[model samples]
Target: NVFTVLLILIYLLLTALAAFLAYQTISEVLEKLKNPVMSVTYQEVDSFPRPGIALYPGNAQLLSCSHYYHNDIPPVVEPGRPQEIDCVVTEVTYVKRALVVRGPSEVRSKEMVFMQFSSNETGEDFSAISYMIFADFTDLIDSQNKSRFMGECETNCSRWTFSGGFRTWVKMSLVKTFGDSVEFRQESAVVKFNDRRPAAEQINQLYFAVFQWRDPYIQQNKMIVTANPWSSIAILSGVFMALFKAANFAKLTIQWIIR
Candidate 1:
């Protein structure tokens, strides 16, 4: 009787430990299933798709709109003269004209659009030329009317400005938001533009801007689930089998001793 009770108590104690261990495993999995961790990843790229750079010059005259690569620019031979541009100019409005140019795409090798403009007016708030970026260049070129496209862009597109009489170097990186939206993170460094143009010479307010990609990687947040139900269940099954085998061995020993 004493040995039978001893075996029962021993089995009960072992069962208690097994029950606690199973509890921990099951709860650990359940916790992981309930709350997923945030995973951030970067997608490397050779080049990004071409984008449309919408320039709202207003009164500022666009002197030179050139695209350059590899973070290098040629020295100025003729400083104040009008230089040729290598981009398509899409005129939007009859009154308020917006010069649209297709921006460069090779981010791996580095892409920058160097644009220069001059304005005579020292006008209110120091006279800044506004520009915006979007991937809608392909759509607009294939569409019937760009007027409607501009109509939508004025309201939807995010716009930023560069100050006149100074060179603004802007570096941007693409960020994929949690929502299905494209976002750009930009950082700017302004440099003093040495006019060198004698007697001002219609270059009172000079606008020189450079747009480049900061890096080739696009960052995004993702959900990671770390739940393993199959493995957890297998562990519980092994533990239960151990209990059954122990109980069987104790029962046989008890019967033999009684005899």
Candidate 2:
């Protein structure tokens, strides 16, 4: 009876030791989730409306505007703060399919309106930025005069224009690398203006821009340093070796038990 009680005590002690080791392993894994890594991926930013503008023409018959961010992290900067990710507005292009004059108008034709603009002094490092907008004319045109014009509407016999400015401005600033922690993320939608057309009217095209980062790339090797499952297998093998050692100790005491 005494021998049986001693064996039970030994088994309990061994089990406790194994449990402690397993707990330590799991705790170490959890602690690593926040350690130093290459980049930190942020959730898509869905903030309140920003400040920008959209403009309308004086002699055009079509109205259109759109604005949005492209990537996951949209960086915003103000004066007297850490200046980063500055993307100035370069140009705004408007594409038109048809321009017709049904009323007493003279010039009416299809034309693509291209507006050139620039961003003034912003700041420095354009980092971790999606796309922003200075103006978006998604649906800012509503006029009754259905007319067209020629050569920037030179012969303005009878012409009407639909024009408006965006309420907020957004642009894709450059990506900034700060210290060891970089912002890494998959492609995220910053801002968008879809015409809400039927599935058939939706036309696909090549519309994308790439922004390069200037600095130390994120260290990807240490990001997921946790041991994989294969590692666990190797560890289990080690545990099996420990069990053999323990079994030998058990055998050494067996003769005493028999006595």
Candidate 3:
């Protein structure tokens, strides 16, 4: 009888230890599953903040530049006569570009900027102009300096080229994505440019591009946890209590065997 009771106690002690370890392992797994880390994903939005367009004309000359809100009528582009731009233009010799124009800055109004450039330097397979969009235009305006503006764009902007002779209308959207690394997201669509130039001067390629807001929205994800500390404490308390009871029973059974 003493032997049987001793065996029962030993089995109980082993079972209790096994149960406790199992509970701990399962709890950790559950906690991790409940509190999974977050990730960033971009969705095409209908509205977004007005993004800044940084223009690098290269060998081409800017003909006209103007901006207006989406709700209002956009200005007309006249041939040969390029309209004046509201923002400042600066030279950054480091990039080997002569001029960089910062586009309009009215974000809340959902502004769109229209730009036209003409390049007489032909003989190439295709003519193209490089441009980039940034998060803010005020940073350039506030700084009022050329090198600083170019420096900021060199890191934060997205570069693109629009082919000449074709009026390319670009639709732009922005996303602020961050996780392993933080960076701006820009989506664009290009279309053929309608030529208004005289047929005789068709050789002189003209490039047109429109910069507008994608949508007024921001996207982000945050990690969440469903683990409850109170529940964990209760489980631990029960496991320890059962372990102590098993140990006490083992000790008593051993004493009985000695007697």
Best by TM-score: 1
- RMSD value for candidate 1: 4.3
What would the per-residue lDDT of candidate 2 be over residues 1-259, giving only the tens digit for each residue? 5776776677667766766776666666557644645554433322211212222222222222212222232322211123222222223234222222111101111111112212221242221112222211221123232122122222221222211221111212212245432222222233333334365523321122222221222223224344455665577567757756775686568557688
Per-residue lDDT of 239 in model 1: 83
Which residue runs of candidate 3 sit more than 4 Å off their true CA positions? 2-36, 39-51, 71-77, 104-109, 166-174, 177-182, 221-238, 245-259
**Each candidate: RMSD:** 4.3, 20.4, 5.5
lDDT of 1 by residue, 45-82 (tens): 87888777788877777677777778888765655657
lDDT of 2: 0.31
Ranking by TM-score: 1, 3, 2
Off by over 4 Å in 1: 38-43, 76-84, 88-98, 120-123, 144-160, 175-182, 199-203, 215-221, 233-259
lDDT of 3 by residue, 1-259 (tens): 5676767768776786868676885678587666656665555444443345667776777777677676464545366765566564556646456354555444457676677777777566667777766665555556757576677568656577777765555655444544332335555556665766678877677777766654554555445454666666676677767777777777777778669
Error of 2 at 29 (Å): 2.7
Question: Which 10 residues in a row give candidate 2 its minimum summed lDDT?
Answer: 101-110
